[PDB]
Amino acid sequence: MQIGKIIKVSGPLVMAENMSEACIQDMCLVGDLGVIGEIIEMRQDVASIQVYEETSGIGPGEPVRSTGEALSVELGPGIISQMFDGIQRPLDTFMEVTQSNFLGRGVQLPALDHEKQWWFEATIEEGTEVSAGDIIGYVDETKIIQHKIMVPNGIKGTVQKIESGSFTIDDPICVIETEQGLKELTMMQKWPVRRGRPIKQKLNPDVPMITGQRVIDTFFPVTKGGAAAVPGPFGAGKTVVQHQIAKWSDVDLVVYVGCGERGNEMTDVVNEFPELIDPNTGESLMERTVLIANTSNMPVAAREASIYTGITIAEYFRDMGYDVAIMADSTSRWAEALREMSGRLEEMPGDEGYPAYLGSRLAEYYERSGRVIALGSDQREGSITAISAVSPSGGDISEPVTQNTLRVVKVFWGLDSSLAQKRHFPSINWIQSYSLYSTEVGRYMDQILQQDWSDMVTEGMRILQEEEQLNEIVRLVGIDSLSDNDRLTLEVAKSIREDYLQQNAFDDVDTFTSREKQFNMLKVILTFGKEARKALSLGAYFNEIMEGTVAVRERISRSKYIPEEELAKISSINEEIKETIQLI
Amino acid sequence: MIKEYRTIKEVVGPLMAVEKVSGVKYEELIEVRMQNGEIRRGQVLEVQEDKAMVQIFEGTSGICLKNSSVRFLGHPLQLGVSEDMIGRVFDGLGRPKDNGPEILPEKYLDINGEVINPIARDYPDEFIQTGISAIDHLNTLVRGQKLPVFSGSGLPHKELAAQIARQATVLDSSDDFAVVFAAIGITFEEAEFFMEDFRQTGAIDRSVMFMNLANDPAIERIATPRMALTAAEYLAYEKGMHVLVIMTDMTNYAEALREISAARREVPGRRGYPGYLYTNLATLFERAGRIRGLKGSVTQIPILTMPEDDKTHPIPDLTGYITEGQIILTRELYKSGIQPPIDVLPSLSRLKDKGTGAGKTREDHAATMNQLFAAYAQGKQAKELAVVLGESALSDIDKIYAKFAERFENEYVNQGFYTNRTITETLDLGWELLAMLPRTELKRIKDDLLDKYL
Amino acid sequence: MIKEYRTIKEVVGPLMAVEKVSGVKYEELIEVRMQNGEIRRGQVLEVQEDKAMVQIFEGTSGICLKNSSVRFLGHPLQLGVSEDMIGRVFDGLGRPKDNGPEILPEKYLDINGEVINPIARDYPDEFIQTGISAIDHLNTLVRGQKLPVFSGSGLPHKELAAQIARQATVLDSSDDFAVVFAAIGITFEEAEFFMEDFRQTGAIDRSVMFMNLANDPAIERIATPRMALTAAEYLAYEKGMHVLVIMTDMTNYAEALREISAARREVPGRRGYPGYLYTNLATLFERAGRIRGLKGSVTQIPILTMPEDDKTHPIPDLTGYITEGQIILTRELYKSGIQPPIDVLPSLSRLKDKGTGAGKTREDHAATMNQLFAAYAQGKQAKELAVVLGESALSDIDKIYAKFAERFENEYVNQGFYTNRTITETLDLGWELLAMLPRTELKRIKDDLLDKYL
Ligand SMILES: Nc1ncnc2c1ncn2[C@@H]1O[C@H](COP(=O)(O)OP(=O)(O)O)[C@@H](O)[C@H]1O
Ligand SMILES: [Mg+2]
């Protein structure tokens, strides 16, 4: 076989000659160590290679062997509850094999365990004609998640032989009689990460995800198969928001991608998730989660690979008929990696140094997410919800990565430093943030709750918007110059922010809020407003109302800590509000 | 005839270099046969001696250099035009997307088209009633005009464009606009909005779609508009149809144009965009109007999202230098629940004068427009004064204009995305707003009109 | 086999070119022997074929291309480690500068170190009683945490640095911190201040110091943090010590990085700083933490001066994006004679969750942490408008907040540069620092600790 030879080493960019048979996007082993690299450019016999490992100590003369295949992932039983590299390498197995607490290089490791035995339960009869996407059986990878064995893309024929039993992911378990001849199947399939897995068609994401976060699910909701961006300054709460979503969302599987961030943050996830148990089912968080970690001091090029590895794995379970949520923290480091290779390739900027194709790369990523119809005769439904964090410099969201993201996504959670400085968490700016799903979510919520919830969200938002306008007047003239109605509006606005919007993620109860609890909580806050509005019209002053409602408003301020199994203690406030104010 | 070359020299991103060729012409369409049998097309960017530089629409991903050939078809990129295009949906390169039959083309037309002789041009005179007061009255659209919408990310430019194509009509006999839609790097949901709207109104049966989405190649976005405009001019000047062209997003077109110029390592202009950005967009937007002795027309309504909501950005700025006015949406009005959120102060129509007046619309059209505009500008200045300073600082005449601008936005501009106002209803509504102002301050309306109307 | 090439092809500014080489690797360390006996260190930036582009630390001034020798060492920039580094003072490249017995290093280690496997990492949760209540309560430090101090020129961050070094230690443990100090690109008199302080307190007898001066080569200023961290990870992960690393000034490090970047003709990013500033700084701050099954730890406290007191500047901004919190020093507080001038509002700690309630104080003062945050916020908003304008909105609900600030910055936050207080004392003073606010004002979940002490 043809063996190339390095002629140029410059950072993560390596060029090698004697590779005329090499192809674009193909993978190749670079140098003596055999580090992992991908060909991105090629001029005659010499190919430009993007290395996803450290290239220090490597020079010209060393061999380069092309694998003949693109950057791919191993998809099969044993992929869930695993923490992978940027290029899908088991960090736990890496620690065991290399016998080191540090990350070396040039060490090849399969993504899955090809020795472990799995029980394959056949669910299709012989003599049945199948194509791409069709289920031939499943594996109980976890007690909840069934790993459905699907026919790979490009396979088309009749099922000749199939039988249930204990196999590995290498052993043939099914025989397909095709036109080209006979093809035997396994429980594992490989797929290129830069190519999105085929679907029948895309669908409209109209079903709201229950994130458990009140500010999100109420005012700026994201749907199953939707995309949300979280731009903000450092320490605003970007990583915390994605953590809360990855642990509370009503989603089948969670793919968390640690892209160029802190190592302790991935350590915190892989340690606590196995300890967080779902009382209804009993499974831990880690049994529905796949981890991909490439920290900031890990190879920069592998930041890009960590993104494509994560989204492809998400697509794989999406095709099974599962709802999947993928977190990207942070996507700014991805763009930085593109900028790094851009300068190495002697390319042309670009905004702020980024490559000119940055917008295309981003747009192609989010378009791979969404609610779709997976391939197969049954036309099963799958979806990928993309939650991405963006890290602007100085919080300035007019930089390329944020702008190019906001043009393809419909949800925008803009974090604010002044809110974080007031310990107002989450730090979402209710004035500037938005969700273009709010209208469709509104009629969904009205339909499933059988309440005028959409009107409630609009009214609560109007008060917040009217607050800002009133806050302009209090800056020029004293607060004591306002009417009782405006003084009331400010107090209701205070209740919206402090009792509903403010939500500590480190509190046992306040960390999550069910849809039913969100309704009762918002209704109570809005009930006080309407009843106090009636009192003013019936002669009562503003001060007299406030002084005689200290106790009931105190129940309101603590209604966020009310246990989920006793939500009736929240709705009883509505009665107390009417009774106490009527006494005034 | 022509032959295929196995002399590919290098593959660098969207660019390919071929050596040892002959008879290769500038902007010639090529085909790339890969080793797996897959076919990709492209056009020549530069040719010299035995070499040729081409751009590849679908990209160069997965291409093996040694076992791939390149065909030179001996002609530029063309479109098979037919009247059977109507009711069909095509992709970015003009190929069927609706799983229908292959169109039997009447002819093949170079998608760059040709420039209309200024003498042969017929000046756009015919007032188009879009039903939107902020347009029909203040920024009047005329048949054959290029009137774009300047929007931003998150703003309802889709709803606005859909409303126009659904309500646009001349006051004469013809009530038939043929809609040529060109999707450029837009998302699936944005694409589905137009699809569902065209399907429910039945406009899908009399429209032509050229769809290039966000998952589609970016370089295809350069050919997509020319594909649509060639179809537009064909149905208009050879079939006599009144064509309405909707294009979005125009910003995505410039980004693709910037990718090629960056890959070719050209000398950038302002903010990295090519020096020929103005001229390149001009070859698109100038493709509109009427022709003497010919019925039918081409009316363009391009859509672009202003980066960082900045009008001074090269993409909206150079567009304004090309197009005949612009309809601008702002976030301040969208947050105020104004539908459509049109800010008329930076808005413009360069063909409104000779499209309105007596005989077309009504005699008071020009006067009411200038008076409403000036008063609105004065009121907005008064509201800003009420923001930085107190309400007490405002004079009695300041509060009146400030309240005028407030009701002007709430009742006049804000009409709804599904409400169709007639031109008479608009002009009558204009007088009811001017009634809020003192008669002495109406210094843009002569006594003749001032006595006749309220 | 010792390698040395005696023919230099090309010298363009600070860059060099050596031909006819083989076996030369990327980032390889080299030495150039001048004709006057001088030896200069260099670094291989890039290698093509039989050529190697290298950069010399001390510059290429006075270098001949025929009468010089370039020795390729066959290894990157290293550090000589040993048991006898404690009590010694080193260079920016690890060379002795205290004129004591030169040490024979056990081995040489790559100053780039290696990336800790995130699975092998041990999350920091052991509380460090720095003594400073502004830190200990509200922005709590933990062993293994990277917590920097953001200051400005003229502010006492050097006094705060020495203070923390003096009095910081772990509770209920015999563990004593081994301090690795790294001076980066500072003047002689600045460096002499630390040398003097470490000797008087006797801190030198338990420390390793890497002194890099301002007129030292820019590459050496860049190498200094990696030299110190390699020594830190050595003493921790091989000797089992709990190492406290202190670096200053990081602003100088960034400026040196910017100079080197321009010399290599790299296109500047935001505000003229390199595109890899985030990545580069991340290869330093991520070196902190703990490891499973290994005794010892690495704690970092970076120090930097914010240019023009601007926090949005690339240097403190990208630092804030990497590190686990930040300690802010403002002139407004320092003008009030406050030492340390710590502003708790822009300050933060990301690892204060497991540090609190475990080492201290079972929610005794872990709980009030979010109150003093939220109460001082309104206490500042009140004090802002009540000072410039008249009577506050309330003397019980709005001016009561003003009472809880002035003294709780002159006392609660004051402390002292050579003054040390225990955490118990801090939680003691803290309950007394609420002076004076009634039980109506403390809106916390508990009524228990409101009764135990005043
Ligand atoms: N929802 C929340 N509840 C409580 N504290 C929060 C919340 N979000 C952020 N914080 C606090 O703010 C800090 C910033 O967290 P992080 O998400 O890491 O910031 P970013 O990701 O924006 O850099 C954390 O240390 C945490 O203590
Ligand atoms: Mg973070």
CATH classification of the domain holding A492? 1.10.1140.10
SS3 C189: helix
Q: Is there a single domain that holds both residue A71 and residue A166?
A: no
Which of A213, A215, A239, A240 has most ligand 1 atoms within 8 Å of its beta carbon, as the pocket-test mutant? A240
Length of chain C: 454
- Structure tokens that stand for B14 in this block: 């969207």
> A476 lies in which domain range?
448-583
Q: Is there a single domain that holds both residue A65 and residue A130?
A: no
Rounded to the nearest whole angstrom, what is the distance from the C-alpha of residue A239 to the centroid of ligand 2?
Answer: 4
A201-203/A381-390 β-pairing: unpaired
SS3 C165: helix
Q: Is there a single domain that holds both residue A464 and residue A568?
A: yes
Burial per residue of C400-437, b for 16 or more beta-carbon CB atoms within 10 angstroms, e otherwise: bbbbbbeebbeebbbbeeeeebebeebbeebbebbeee
d(CA A122, CA C323): 51
Q: Is there a single domain that holds both residue A60 and residue A143?
A: no
What are the chain B neighbours of A42 within 8 Å (beta carbons)? 10-12, 65
Tell the residue nearest (CA) to atom 27 of ligand 1. C350
d(CA C160, CA B34): 66
- Closest-lying ligand to the alpha carbon of A237? 1
What are the chain B neighbours of A367 within 8 Å (beta carbons)? 187-188, 213-215
SS3 A343: helix
**Given A25, A356, A476, which is nearest B61 (Cβ)?**
A25
Closest atom of ligand 1 to A243 CA is 17
d(CA B326, CA B316): 9
Q: Give the closest residue to A384 by CA, choosing from A132, A197, A575, A579.
A: A197
> What distance in Å separates residue A356's CA from the closest CA in chain B?
5
d(CA B241, CA B298): 9
Spatial contact of A500 and A216, defined as CB atoms under 8 Å apart: no
Residues 6+ apart with CB under 8 A from B203: B165, B166, B179, B197
Q: DSSP label at A196?
A: P
Compare all CA atoms of chain A with the CA of C23 and give the residue at the minimum distance: A59
Q: Which of A83, A97, A234 to mutate to test the interface with C (most CBs of C within 10 A)?
A: A234
Q: Between chains, do A360 and B60 touch, taking CB under 8 Å as contact?
A: no
- Relative orientation angle of helices A453-476 and A484-495, to the nearest 10 degrees: 120
Residues of B with CB under 8 A from a CB of A: 9-13, 60-66, 153-154, 185, 187-189, 192, 213-215, 218, 249, 251-252, 255-256, 258-259, 262-263, 265-266, 268, 271-272, 305, 307-308, 335, 387, 389-390
Q: Give the closest residue to A295 by CA, choosing from C285, B23, B253.
A: C285
Q: Which of B16, B18, B66 to mutate to test the interface with A (most CBs of A within 10 A)?
A: B66
What are the chain A neighbours of C401 within 8 Å (beta carbons)? none
Question: For position A62, which CATH number holds?
Answer: 2.40.30.20
Going C345 to C351 to C356 to C359, the CA torsion angle's sign is: negative
Q: Between chains, do A364 and B214 touch, taking CB under 8 Å as contact?
A: yes
Q: Give the closest residue to A366 by CA, choosing from A425, A426, A424, A411.
A: A411
Rounded to the nearest whole angstrom, what is the distance from the C-alpha of residue C312 to the centroid of ligand 1?
Answer: 19
Residue with tokens 């347009």: B135
Rounded to the nearest whole angstrom, what is the distance from the C-alpha of residue A236 to the centroid of ligand 1?
Answer: 6
- Structure tokens that stand for A468 in this block: 């800002």
C325-329/B88-91 β-pairing: unpaired
Residue type at A32 in one-letter notation = D
Q: Is there a single domain that holds both residue A62 and residue A131?
A: no
Q: Between chains, do B10 and A43 touch, taking CB under 8 Å as contact?
A: yes
Going C54 to C58 to C63 to C68, the CA torsion angle's sign is: negative
Rounded to the nearest whole angstrom, what is the distance from the C-alpha of residue C349 to the centroid of ligand 2?
Answer: 12
Annotation-wise, does A263 bind a ligand?
A: no
Direct distance between the N- and C-terminal alpha carbons of chain B, in angstroms, rounded to an integer: 76
Q: Between chains, do B13 and A70 touch, taking CB under 8 Å as contact?
A: no
3-state SS track over chain B: CCCEECCEEEEECCEEEECCCCCCCCCCEEEEECCCCCEEEEEEEEEECCEEEEEECCCCCCCECCCCEEEECCCCCEEEECHHHCCEEEECCCCECCCCCCCCCCEEEECCCCCCCCCCEECCCCEEECCCHHHHCCCCCECCCECCEEECCCCCHHHHHHHHHHHCEECCCCCCCEEEEEEEEECHHHHHHHHHHHHHHCHHHHEEEEEEECCCCCHHHHCHHHHHHHHHHHHHHCCCCEEEEEEECHHHHHHHHHHHHHHCCCCECHHHCECCHHHHHHHHHCCCEEECCCCCEEEEEEEEECHHHCCCCHHHHHHHHHCCEEEEECHHHHCCCCCCCECCCCCEECCCHHHCCCCCCCCCHHHHHHHHHHHHHHHHHHHHHHHHCCHHHCCHHHHHHHHHHHHHHHHHHCCCCCCCCCHHHHHHHHHHHHCCCCHHHCCCCCHHHHHHCC
Q: How far from A118 is each of A110, A142, A377, A427, CA to CA, in Å?
A: 17, 11, 26, 46
d(CA B167, CA C166): 78
Residues 6+ apart with CB under 8 A from C393: A478, A479, A480, C382, C399
Q: Give the closest residue to B305 by CA, choosing from A403, C174, A120.
A: A403
Compare all CA atoms of chain A with the CA of C376 and give the residue at the minimum distance: A422
Compare all CA atoms of chain A with the CA of B391 and give the residue at the minimum distance: A473
Q: How many domains does chain C have?
A: 1
Q: Give the closest residue to A89 by CA, choosing from A305, A330, A324, A331.
A: A305
d(CA A374, CA A198): 8
Bond preceding residue B250 cis, omega within 30 of 0: no
Residues 6+ apart with CB under 8 A from A410: A226, A227, A435, A436, A437, B189
Residues contacting ligand 1 via CB (< 6 Å): A 232, 234-240, 425-426, 504-506; C 348, 350
Q: Which of A13, A45, A267, A291 to mutate to test the interface with C (most CBs of C within 10 A)?
A: A267
Compare all CA atoms of chain A with the CA of B393 and give the residue at the minimum distance: A476
Q: Is there a single domain that holds both residue A518 and residue A576?
A: yes
What are the chain B neighbours of A205 within 8 Å (beta carbons)? 189
Q: Is there a single domain that holds both residue A456 and residue A565?
A: yes
d(CA A288, CA A85): 18
Chains touching chain C, criterion 3+ CB pairs below 8 Å: A
Burial of A43 (0-12, 13-18, 19+ CB in 10 A): middle
Chains touching chain A, criterion 3+ CB pairs below 8 Å: B, C
Annotation-wise, does A152 bind a ligand?
A: no
Spatial contact of B31 and B40, defined as CB atoms under 8 Å apart: yes
Q: Give the closest residue to A374 by CA, choosing from A452, A327, A318, A323.
A: A318
Annotation-wise, does A239 bind a ligand?
A: yes
- Ion ligand 2 residue ranges (Cβ < 5 Å): A 239
Q: How many CA atoms lie within 13 A of A261 on its CB side?
A: 28
Rounded to the nearest whole angstrom, what is the distance from the C-alpha of residue A491 to the centroid of ligand 2?
Answer: 33
Length of chain B: 454
Closest atom of ligand 1 to A389 CA is 21
Going B362 to B365 to B367 to B372, the CA torsion angle's sign is: positive
- Structure tokens that stand for A338 in this block: 């593109």
Residue with tokens 């050097």: C158
**Given C275, C318, C345, which is nearest A340 (Cβ)?**
C275
Closest atom of ligand 1 to A234 CA is 23
**Beta-carbon pairs below 8 A across chains A and B:** 106
A72-75/A146-150 β-pairing: unpaired
Rounded to the nearest whole angstrom, what is the distance from the C-alpha of residue C145 to the centroid of ligand 2?
Answer: 14
> C143 lies in which domain range?
1-454
Residues 6+ apart with CB under 8 A from A157: A129, A130, A176, A177, A178, A179, A183
- Angstrom resolution of this structure: 2.7
